[PDB]
Amino acid sequence: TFISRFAPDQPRKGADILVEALERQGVETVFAYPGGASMEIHQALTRSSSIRNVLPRHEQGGVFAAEGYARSSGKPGICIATSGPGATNLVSGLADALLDSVPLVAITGQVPRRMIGTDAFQETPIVEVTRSITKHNYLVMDVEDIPRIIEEAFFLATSGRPGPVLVDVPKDIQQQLAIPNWEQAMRLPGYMSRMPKPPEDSHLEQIVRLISESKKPVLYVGGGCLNSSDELGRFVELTGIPVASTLMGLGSYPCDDELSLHMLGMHGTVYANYAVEHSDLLLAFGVRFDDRVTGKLEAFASRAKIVHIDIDSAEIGKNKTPHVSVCGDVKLALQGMNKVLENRAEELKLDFGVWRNELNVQKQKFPLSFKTFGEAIPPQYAIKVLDELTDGKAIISTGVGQHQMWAAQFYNYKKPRQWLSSGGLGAMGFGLPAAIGASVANPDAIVVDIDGDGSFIMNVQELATIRVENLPVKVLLLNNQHLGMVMQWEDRFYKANRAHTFLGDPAQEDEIFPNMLLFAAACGIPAARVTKKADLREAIQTMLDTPGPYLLDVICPHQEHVLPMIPSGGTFNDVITEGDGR
Amino acid sequence: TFISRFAPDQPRKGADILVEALERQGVETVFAYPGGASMEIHQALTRSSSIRNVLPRHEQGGVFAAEGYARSSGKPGICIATSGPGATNLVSGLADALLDSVPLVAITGQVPRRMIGTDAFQETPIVEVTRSITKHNYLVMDVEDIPRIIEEAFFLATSGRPGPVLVDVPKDIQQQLAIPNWEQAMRLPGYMSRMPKPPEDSHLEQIVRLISESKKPVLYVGGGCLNSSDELGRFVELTGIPVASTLMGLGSYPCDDELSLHMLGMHGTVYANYAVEHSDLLLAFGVRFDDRVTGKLEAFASRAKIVHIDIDSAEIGKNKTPHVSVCGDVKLALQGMNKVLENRAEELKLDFGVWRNELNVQKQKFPLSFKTFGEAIPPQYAIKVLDELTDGKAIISTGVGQHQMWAAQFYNYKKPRQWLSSGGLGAMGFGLPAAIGASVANPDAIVVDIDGDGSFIMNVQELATIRVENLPVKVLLLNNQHLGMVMQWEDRFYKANRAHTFLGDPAQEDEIFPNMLLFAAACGIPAARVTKKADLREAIQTMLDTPGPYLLDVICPHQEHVLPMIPSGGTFNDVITEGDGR
Amino acid sequence: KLEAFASRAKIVHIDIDSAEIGKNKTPHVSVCGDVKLALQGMNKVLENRAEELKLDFGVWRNELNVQKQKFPLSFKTFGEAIPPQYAIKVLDELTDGKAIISTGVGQHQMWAAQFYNYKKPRQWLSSGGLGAMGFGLPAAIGASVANPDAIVVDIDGDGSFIMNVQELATIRVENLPVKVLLLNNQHLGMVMQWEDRFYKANRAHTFLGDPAQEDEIFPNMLLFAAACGIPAARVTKKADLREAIQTMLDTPGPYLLDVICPHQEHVLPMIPSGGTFNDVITEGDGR
């Protein structure tokens, strides 16, 4: 039973109605940056004793924090911004959430209704701007629509394929007095009629049949499995089918496990891509056959009968055409298949040990590798040490680039929602704010932002947020003084011709620039720099053991290349295994 | 005669064609941040010896810099970004340029043509997203359309009412080899047929007639007059009509002049708003009757015959209905009227000395004012000292808020394009990057960013850009530890109830947080902090005399309110002249 | 050509749509509002200051009345053939200018506007901006329902009329006294006219009759009416025209009068599209 701060017959501002609507959705935390068109909402927030605001220093920091909050918890992330420049600053985060299917509700203040379309002060047609980069959006045109729309927004954001929903609220609506009706019915008849039914037995039996008839099966798991770790683990025990994961699905199956092929794709392991290449049965659970993974589609799993289970019908048959498909929750499909695989367990004689042996040979001949030069610090080694010292239980957010790939390759995530990273849009500056959101959602957890010097400085202002909110966010800054990923492509495809990839100061090219330590000191955040590999272990330990926020500046040689690499649009035969920029 | 780096019969990459197209437009400087979808363009830039790139640390920094470049020169500003997260990071700047009518060409890399619409890696439908916040945009679908589209984009951005134009270029187009045709004809038959003709004599004679029949005329000038300072000055000499300027029109008429009523509007001077209120003839040249200026439209210039000259027909009669109008270049209209006003100079007996005396009485009774408390530093006084020490010849960019209004009130701009400020959208974080663009465009000029601690930290990463590019950007940071403008509205309309407006650290509320000096030190930028009013003059002098970049942290009491103030939607009778938050 | 239009005039524009004020022609004085209210206000002033003002544009009116004598609306009469202009002029006389007139689109539409003197507004129903054929007959239906006691006449062309000929059924079933004055030139006249002046009279699918019997009137519109139980007749000689129209009016209920016209007629005068007043065509047809 919900308790309101207002009487059932007591008229209150629309802004107060909007906040209570959030309270009735179980919202405990918002990321809101005040402005003229949203002042009323911010006032209403202070009257709430159950909702806490985390003030960012930039709205992009706000929305990225909401994403980190969502990704690390499974709850919807909520961010609030003012009209105009506030709203437009959310855009990268909205697109980010849509591409990675992250549940998000974004609320923006708007100019009064009568002022709309007149090019008014701080006015932006944000609904028009964001229609193609949100799952859905709204323009509230009456105070009485607030309870319904808020309920619909949370429902749409969290159900089916999750995604961002934006609600635009005109200032006069916020100021209007009304008595809300919470027993309103949602107006989503089309969306609800197309909601996937629970998986039928006939479809599930067909899959189990294909498994018993295969000899080289491979699991291909992604973001859709983040809530099915238990079910998937049970499935693997009953089948013994090796698991390859996408960038978005890391941790769904334990990375330190024997049957883990780790990540597949452009920078996936040789043995993961091998498995898919030579498979005769491909179990695609919660994936979307993106080109980072497939490369040339005609060569991708060319020998396999393909099973695709997705909650979005639009994804089934989009790029790769499956032989067998199921449109529904992969969690329910796994449960159903587990029931059958156990009751008919000995009737079936599942044993892909010969196939697993073949893959384990590839794992020995072509494992993940890095080279150590003198006392210089290998970024791969740095991440591997972090894994050991945190016992693989840390929440890891990243920026985008080389360090991102290494963070995915050399850390073994035990559970889902430990790995927070921008995959589809691949937005730099994501790491630090996402870590903020994750730490708020998980106060007792070890939270580490593995960032690059390019990505880190993009939203460096959120260091202030971290200190003020007293969040124990650790920053593992891998500093190669470059935009590494772009620099790598220059080396392989443009004869190493540098085109604005150096981030330091050409007047003092051997000096580290900027001095990230002083960025931290500005925000009262303790920090240090390590350069010698011998001192690295103790330095990371110090970062972890020191209570509160910490910045560790890890200096790396920039000549390092992410390996292995399948060129864009290429095949497994085109995989690059050796070489750098020396 | 233009000289190409390629033979007329030599096939070259589309990216090389795009860069030469910029060269043929006279482009000398771009603000580009590299990414996968735009690597080809960046490669092509290095082969150019006439175009220089300024690498920002954030694309929003890039686009804001392009704006500052444009506003301070009258040339189009050019920014380049990669696909996806690069493109979306431009959005605030695009909206900003559209609302303030700033000439801008934005180029974004895009995924290959065949990949469009497939939710590909780093793909954003940026044309769809930005259609409502640009003057026009393009999606290049063939390499042979590049010369035409680039030419059209620059033409559209700089002609008529200036504005931002975005050109989206797919990666495969950049890589395709072709022989460009530069003699292509632009496909803009509609736009060109609606281009305003030069002002007719009959229209101009009607205005001059109204002037001779008036007794209380007032000039109402704005952004449209930025290229007519000479013509406008000549006009004033011949008429003796007092001048009121918008936030966007500052400097069109010299602020230190006797006939200057300074700024009108919400935070305009009492005597400027008085003049308009009691005028019988309102000469609206290059303005758009925004609500910051007019307040309640029915009360705005209720006794005046209104003359409106605008190059955009859609602006004439939008909010306020004029008696006489001219659709065309205000520069040409001024020239025509000057010719008549001089030939019929003694036939006309223009003498509004009685009206000017009435206004000068209001100027004595209600001048701009500030109070000095002990040794604390008045922000108004700080800006006034900067004016004296730079002799009013400095280029001034600002953030958004209280400091912005004070920068407009207490600095007397002699010429147009000294004043760079986000007016229509009012985007924070604009100041520092805009100063960067201005300094690149004007290497020998004194460039000063008058910023607030909220706005400054939003794009603080561009401090790195400043040092690396060795730009003599001065930062006058007015630090009140708050979001001042919002805090002011809290005091007057919400009983001073603080809702997330404090920017410091509540654990050490008397300590200045963050330490902006260390932000500068991180980027090797010399800096200092002043707290006592007695030391202020010497501190600013040091900032100016010190060669290169400099940050001056000016500590101000936060209780200050911007005055005077006409409440939103109010009239002249509702003007607030006294009070703060003490 | 906008640059030539009223090039010597100070322009006053009163419109209730602000988007229309300054769109094509830039006014010196404008009022955004109801023209009805503007007229009322100006009338009050023009009467109170009536003798203070000495308004007398008799010299200007004399100059125009000279042009009216030298260049009036005209048509030519060939033998016993029926001039469509004359047909409409006779309808005006016999209905005393009090009839509601709907039209199709084309030559007959222009003649209906030129040679009928409408006394009051909302007598004239015609598609102007879009200019949609097949408008006449259904519009007459709507007008007759709204104005049961009024004389309603659809002045239509054989191309426009047949486009929605099915509404003849509607007319009979609803027992509406809709009169149809069908001006039949066996062609798409307006298009045919442009062919004559701009394409050397090269016919491109403008003939509406049957090429196997090109002198026979096709289709037989009388039988269209008979199908829907609507009394009808056809007139060909100018001498019988007056009595035929009278019969149409005096006959209670719906009626179709098929008026046969020579197709060589051109709508005059004509200013070519995008032209000026100096480019006005005053003479010529397709003979």
Ligand SMILES: Cc1cc2nc3c(=O)[nH]c(=O)nc-3n(C[C@H](O)[C@H](O)[C@H](O)COP(=O)(O)OP(=O)(O)OC[C@H]3O[C@@H](n4cnc5c(N)ncnc54)[C@H](O)[C@@H]3O)c2cc1C
């Ligand atoms: C520099 C860089 C390099 C990259 N290289 C790689 C790489 O080498 N390898 C790699 O894998 N990725 C790589 N990516 C990431 C890549 O772009 C995509 O983000 C990722 O591959 C797609 O993840 P996904 O296939 O698991 O589908 P997701 O984007 O995670 O979407 C989840 C899918 O499952 C469905 N789904 C959601 N919930 C359910 C449910 N309950 N039941 C059933 N279905 C559900 C959804 O409809 C959707 O189709 C890289 C990114 C960057 C920035």
Ligand SMILES: Cc1cc2nc3c(=O)[nH]c(=O)nc-3n(C[C@H](O)[C@H](O)[C@H](O)COP(=O)(O)OP(=O)(O)OC[C@H]3O[C@@H](n4cnc5c(N)ncnc54)[C@H](O)[C@@H]3O)c2cc1C
């Ligand atoms: C916190 C804050 C407070 C503000 N308060 C105020 C205030 O108190 N007073 C104030 O004035 N502003 C204030 N503003 C700014 C305000 O929102 C607008 O930016 C500004 O008032 C509009 O400028 P403008 O009227 O000159 O037209 P502009 O936005 O500058 O546009 C120029 C106009 O002239 C036309 N034009 C352009 N070129 C030509 C040409 N060659 N010939 C003829 N016409 C041309 C254009 O079509 C356009 O209509 C404030 C902004 C902020 C952020």
Ligand SMILES: Cc1ncc(Cn2c(C)c(CCOP(=O)(O)OP(=O)(O)O)sc2=O)c(N)n1
């Ligand atoms: C906002 C933005 N701009 C540009 C890019 C393109 N981009 C860029 C410029 C990368 C290099 C990132 O540099 P870094 O220092 O943050 O990390 P690494 O040096 O490890 O690559 S990665 C990449 O794909 C992007 N993903 N996001």
Ligand SMILES: Cc1ncc(Cn2c(C)c(CCOP(=O)(O)OP(=O)(O)O)sc2=O)c(N)n1
């Ligand atoms: C990106 C963004 N967010 C929010 C606002 C709304 N806003 C805010 C939050 C202002 C206060 C700015 O604080 P400041 O420190 O930069 O300057 P002052 O303290 O002098 O006001 S001003 C204003 O209109 C805005 N204009 N732009």
Ligand SMILES: Cc1ncc(Cn2c(C)c(CCOP(=O)(O)OP(=O)(O)O)sc2=O)c(N)n1
């Ligand atoms: C539905 C439609 N199609 C085509 C046209 C173009 N059009 C055509 C084909 C006209 C000739 C109409 O023939 P008509 O018999 O109805 O009238 P006239 O012979 O008097 O011109 S008039 C004209 O502008 C149109 N206006 N409407």
Ligand SMILES: COC(=O)c1csc(C)c1S(=O)(=O)NC(=O)n1nc(OC)n(C)c1=O
């Ligand atoms: C924020 O912009 C708006 O909401 C706005 C656009 S038009 C219009 C009448 C309004 S408002 O309702 O009357 N609030 C307002 O002007 N302001 N102006 C401010 O600072 C100048 N603030 C803080 C407002 O709320």
Ligand SMILES: COC(=O)c1csc(C)c1S(=O)(=O)NC(=O)n1nc(OC)n(C)c1=O
């Ligand atoms: C940048 O994104 C794209 O341009 C892109 C989307 S789909 C597709 C086939 C391409 S690309 O032409 O083949 N370049 C590319 O993949 N990448 N990938 C990169 O890093 C992973 N870089 C730097 C690219 O250019």
Ligand SMILES: [K+]
């Ligand atoms: K930033």
Ligand SMILES: [Mg+2]
């Ligand atoms: Mg780097």
Ligand SMILES: [Mg+2]
């Ligand atoms: Mg401040």
Ligand SMILES: [Mg+2]
């Ligand atoms: Mg005809």
